[PDB]
């Protein structure tokens, strides 16, 4: 397959995807999200101490 | 300090296209071009070591070139570098050649010999020198202006860059196997010869002496010198010693790049007049030079070209002036004035063409 799916954004949920390749052996695969790292704009403006 | 000689290794050279169609066994061949200087100086790989010798002197009369398991030498006044024009050699240092020269379909280097008969490695080599800035030149410049750029810095201290230098495949010399009545006397002559024979009693193996290979002929014998004493390099385009992986190449290769400025030609100032909501610009040319222009509002509407001759170009001007950039000079800036005159007040109306100066012919539908 070129199996494009949309798994829910949940860390640690085993998504069981199906590969019924055409006239081929069926194949179930597991995926599991482990981190969601979001890093915003690194724009330091000024300081205060 | 000042030695490269002993990290070199004796993998040889046969120049696969030395000119006039075909090939020859030549050690002085061209392998690589480095053209990434912005100004247009040229950095060239050779399979020789220049500025330096066997015994590592700065002499310019000897240079290590490999002629059939021999270190021979050559004058560094006989350096005939030529793409279409003969090039202007500046830097001669080991692996490296630095020169400034114009456009050409091919590129060659020429060299004298120990037999003092100059030849040339001549490869079809479509190096094209780049363009930079906006200007070209007719005569040599000694009076010019500034342009930032980059060129190869002339420094010996460029470490941790290498070429592939490795133990030789062999040096198969079929002039070592003399025949003694259907035998073969492998005349090694102070070498280390690996023979590969399709005969009896001595097939494949090393020898240091003029060995007797009986019932064997020249086509039945081989004389391949395992060179491990005299060491002179090439490119890794030629094959390896094929008994293991690679002898790792370690030679620091100098002359890095750095940023400078340059005495660029300037651009001649053109002449202009104003006219009714427009401008009239005659241009003194010098050479084919680009020109650009734009206006100063919601879009620049910038139009660009190369101009070549004494060119009178007419441009209408909006209410926001005009910006014409010609050469690397000042970007010429302009603003409109209401042009000549409408009228008097008088017995007729005669303010309509007052109004054809002030908001000319726009919002005249409304009245």
């Amino acid at each position: 397959y070129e199996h494009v799916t949309v798994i829910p954004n949940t860390v640690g949920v085993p998504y069981k995807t199906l590969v019924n390749r055409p006239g081929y052996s069926p194949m179930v695969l597991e995926m599991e999200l482990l981190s969601v790292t979001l890093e915003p704009t690194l724009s330091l403006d000024y300081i205060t101490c | 300090n000042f030695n490269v000689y002993k990290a070199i290794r004796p993998y040889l050279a046969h120049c696969p296209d030395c000119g006039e169609g075909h090939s020859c066994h030549s050690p002085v061949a061209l392998e690589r071009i480095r053209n990434e200087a912005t100004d247009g100086t040229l950095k060239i790989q050779v399979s020789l070591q220049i500025g330096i010798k066997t015994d590592d002197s700065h002499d310019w009369t000897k240079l290590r070139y490999m002629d059939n398991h021999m270190p021979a030498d050559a004058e560094r006044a006989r350096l005939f570098v030529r793409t279409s024009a003969p090039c202007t050699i500046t830097g001669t240092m080991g692996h490296f050649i630095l020169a400034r020269c114009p456009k050409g379909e091919t590129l060659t280097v020429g060299f004298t010999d120990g037999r003092k008969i100059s030849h040339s490695c001549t490869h079809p080599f479509h190096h094209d020198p780049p363009v930079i800035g906006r200007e070209k030149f007719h005569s040599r410049p000694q009076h010019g202006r500034e342009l930032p750029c980059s060129t190869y810095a002339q420094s010996t201290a460029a470490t941790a860059e290498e070429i592939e230098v490795h133990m030789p495949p062999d040096t198969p010399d079929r002039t070592l196997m003399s025949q003694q009545s259907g035998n073969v006397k492998i005349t090694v002559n102070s070498q280390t010869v690996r023979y590969k024979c399709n005969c009896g009693d001595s097939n494949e193996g090393l020898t240091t002496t003029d060995k007797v290979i009986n019932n064997c002929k020249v086509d039945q014998c081989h004389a391949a010198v395992t060179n491990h004493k005299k060491w002179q390099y090439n490119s890794p385009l030629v094959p390896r010693n094929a008994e293991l992986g690679d002898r790792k190449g370690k030679v620091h290769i100098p002359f890095p790049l750095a940023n400078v400025t340059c005495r660029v030609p300037k651009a001649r100032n053109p002449t202009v007049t104003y006219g009714k909501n427009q401008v009239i610009m005659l241009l003194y040319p010098d050479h084919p030079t680009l020109l650009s222009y734009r206006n100063m509002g919601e879009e620049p509407n910038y139009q660009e070209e190369w101009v070549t001759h004494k060119k009178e170009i007419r441009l209408t001007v909006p209410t926001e002036g005009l910006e014409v950039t010609w050469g690397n000079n000042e970007p010429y800036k302009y603003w409109p004035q209401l042009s000549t005159n409408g009228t008097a007040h008088g017995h007729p109306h005669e303010i309509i063409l007052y109004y054809y100066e002030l908001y000319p012919t726009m919002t005249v539908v409304v009245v």
Partner: protein, 60 residues
């Protein structure tokens, strides 16, 4: 200083087992040095020791 390894001893790259002039006493062990010790930057100082004219052959 910087630790060069010819697979047997963790010697300095300034102090090889053959200080100075490696090729002037061994060609092919210098070639195995050129195969192995090239992972060390201080080996260049050994190349200033062995290769780049600091041998026994200089009268220094």
């Amino acid at each position: 200083p910087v630790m060069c390894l010819l697979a047997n001893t963790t010697f300095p790259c300034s102090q090889p087992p053959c200080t100075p002039c490696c090729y002037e006493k061994e060609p092919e062990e210098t070639l195995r040095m050129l195969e192995d010790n090239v992972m060390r930057p201080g080996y260049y100082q050994l190349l200033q020791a062995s290769l780049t004219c600091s041998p026994h052959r200089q009268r220094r």
